[PDB]
């Protein structure tokens, strides 16, 4: 569970992330696909899974918009994510172990874009946030 300090840290770093949200989403998704190619199994219907390609940019925005929205729902991430959990479980049938893979790549991207701001304490809070987000996405499985 997020403490008040964790929540404050997440909101603070998102102040930096927000103006670059589309680019950060593209970067994070691109890195997930290339660095962890196991994840490509879900995206073979796209015209490309290359970094910076049209489908990757488009879906990078979809992911990051959702994560941006979650920053405003940190008091009840599970309820906020119920319909999206159902979608990933029942419609898309995504093995939920992949959620932490995306989280890792987003962390790497945030570090790359905001090195001075992404201190170990901020990193800890962001990791706690993204782990809870992953669990919320896994909630309606099985």
């Amino acid at each position: 569970s997020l403490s008040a300090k964790d929540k404050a840290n997440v909101k603070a770093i998102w102040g930096k992330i927000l103006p670059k949200s589309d680019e950060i989403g593209e970067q994070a998704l691109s890195r997930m696909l290339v660095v962890y190619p196991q994840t490509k199994a879900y995206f073979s219907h796209w015209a490309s899974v290359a970094p910076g390609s049209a489908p990757v940019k488009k879906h990078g925005i979809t992911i990051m918009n959702q994560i941006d929205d979650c920053v405003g729902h940190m008091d009840d991430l599970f309820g906020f994510l119920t319909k999206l959990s159902e979608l990933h479980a029942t419609k898309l049938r995504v093995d939920p172990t992949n959620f932490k893979i995306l989280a890792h790549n987003l962390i790497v991207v945030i570090a790359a874009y905001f090195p001075a701001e992404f201190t170990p304490e901020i990193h800890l809070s962001v990791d706690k946030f993204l782990q809870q987000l992953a669990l919320a996405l896994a909630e309606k499985y099985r």
Partner: protein, 147 residues
């Protein structure tokens, strides 16, 4: 991978006391129920509406046998498992689009079914150690050609 003589002996000995034709269908049916996202790949296999339907499904059963006999050549040459699965690996990646994490989940179901079949004395801690090591090498080999 470096096998100890004990591990080598235990893998070959264990494999020899199970019927791949019985365990395969049990393991695959178990996977489809315990990790149900895996059903993504078998919707053309007929009736999968209920656990009972999955358990009685002859297409699932035939395929479970194929999976298990796929492990035969790994047991046959424990020293060349990486190269044994090259073709199978690209097929599962590029043709079937199977998330390779599901190989781990299937292997865990195979372990459960073997333990149920043989019991805790025959499927001892040391036998499980060797079998787990074997399954981990197989699972790595199956994911090897994913790019």
């Amino acid at each position: 991978v470096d096998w100890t003589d004990a591990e080598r002996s235990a893998i070959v000995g264990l494999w020899g006391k199970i019927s791949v034709d019985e365990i395969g269908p049990q393991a695959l049916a178990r996977l489809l129920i315990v990790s149900p996202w895996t059903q993504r790949h078998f919707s053309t296999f007929g009736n999968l509406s209920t656990p009972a339907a999955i358990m009685g499904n002859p297409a699932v059963a035939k395929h479970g046998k194929t999976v298990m006999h796929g492990l035969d050549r790994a047991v046959q040459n424990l020293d060349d498992i990486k190269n044994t699965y090259v073709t199978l690996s690209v097929m599962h990646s590029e043709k079937l689009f199977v998330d390779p994490d599901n190989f781990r989940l299937l292997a865990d179901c195979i372990t459960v079914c073997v333990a149920a079949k043989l019991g805790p004395a025959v499927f001892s801690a040391d036998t499980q150690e060797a079998f787990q090591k074997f399954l981990a090498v197989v699972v790595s080999a199956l994911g090897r050609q994913y790019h």
